[PDB]
């Protein structure tokens, strides 16, 4: 029983009492990490649909830009007031779109100091392209790439740009990712 997510059992035909049920989910006492769905984040319909368009175009129909040739919209910035549901929407895109999700960028990174973090970051975007259509989320893009008010910078802002300039490759070849930022 140790470390099992839910109590497992071995099926053996004939000896088991199979029973039907109308229940759409498993026994609540299993305390399962239940999926997250658009039936929960509803209340932002039009932007949900626009998000679905922004997942259609780079995942399903990258080929349909090789014709018409023009550079595709392969960077998304989902901004809004704090607590409005941005992180929940990003989470529903992650679980209800069947792309491979490249790991969350986050405010945290090895050292949080220039030079050291520059390679540790590029690795996340190097992981992109190789996998079948993916989605790399860069949530809290104000904490990873701040404004550079007068001189506040490591190197991270220009490092993000220089890497995004290669992440934007696609739809001629390696059109297998889109980046979604979130911000307050």
């Amino acid at each position: 029983n140790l470390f099992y997510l839910s109590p497992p059992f071995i099926f053996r035909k004939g000896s088991t009492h199979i029973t039907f049920s109308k229940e759409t989910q498993a026994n609540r006492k299993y305390n399962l990490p239940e999926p997250l769905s658009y039936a929960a984040v509803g209340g932002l319909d039009k932007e949900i649909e626009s998000l679905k368009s922004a997942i259609e175009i780079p995942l399903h129909q990258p080929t349909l830009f090789s014709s018409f040739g023009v550079s595709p919209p392969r960077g998304i910035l989902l901004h809004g007031p704090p607590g409005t549901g941005k992180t929940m929407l990003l989470r529903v895109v992650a679980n209800t779109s069947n792309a491979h999700v490249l790991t969350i960028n986050g405010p945290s990174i090895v050292s949080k100091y220039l030079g050291e973090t520059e390679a540790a970051l590029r690795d996340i975007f190097n992981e992109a392209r190789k996998y079948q259509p993916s989605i790399i989320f860069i949530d809290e893009i104000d904490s990873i790439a701040p404004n550079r008010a007068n001189d506040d910078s490591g190197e991270v802002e220009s490092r993000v740009v220089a890497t995004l300039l290669t992440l934007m490759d696609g739809m001629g070849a390696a059109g297998k990712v889109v980046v979604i930022a979130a911000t307050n």
């Binding site: 290669t166 490759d169 070849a173 390696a174």
Partner: protein, 160 residues
């Protein structure tokens, strides 16, 4: 111990482009030895992070050519939009491209290729090229009149 440069520098190929030297980008022989690359062999040339392009390895003069410099005939630089000073990434190829069965050949300005130039000279250029990917250009082509410059781009090639 000789150190192989990570990135090579594109530069003109003083030799003409009309010859059999379309994809035979001369490479400094020291690099050819240091990378287990045989003469007259195919290898991948491309800008950092980009998908590779096919070139044929031919040995050049040690004294004239510095180590970094890689010389490309102006027909193949136009394949992958290789402008001068574009840093490259030499790697060893492993698959020989199969032969060709059909090629659709384009032009700069839509001039009737049948009416302006002979098929024989075009076939000569194409055969002497050897390996043809879609995207090069054959420039400074003398026409029947001898006073017209029409450049042979190649739109596509299909294998049946």
């Amino acid at each position: 111990k000789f150190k192989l440069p990570a990135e090579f520098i594109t530069r003109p190929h003083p030799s003409k482009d009309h010859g059999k030297e379309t994809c035979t980008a001369y490479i400094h022989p020291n690099v050819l030895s240091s990378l287990e690359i045989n003469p007259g062999s195919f290898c991948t040339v491309g800008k950092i992070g980009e998908n590779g392009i096919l070139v044929i390895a031919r040995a050049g003069d040690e004294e004239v050519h510095p180590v970094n410099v890689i010389t490309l005939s102006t027909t193949i630089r136009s394949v992958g939009n290789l402008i001068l000073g574009d840093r490259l990434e030499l790697k060893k190829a492993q698959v020989q491209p199969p032969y060709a069965t059909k090629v659709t050949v384009g032009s700069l300005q839509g001039y009737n290729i049948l009416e302006c130039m002979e098929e024989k000279v075009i076939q000569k250029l194409l055969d002497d090229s050897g390996v043809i990917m879609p995207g090069m250009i054959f420039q400074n082509l003398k026409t029947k009149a001898g006073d017209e410059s029409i450049d042979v781009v190649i739109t596509d090639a299909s294998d049946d």
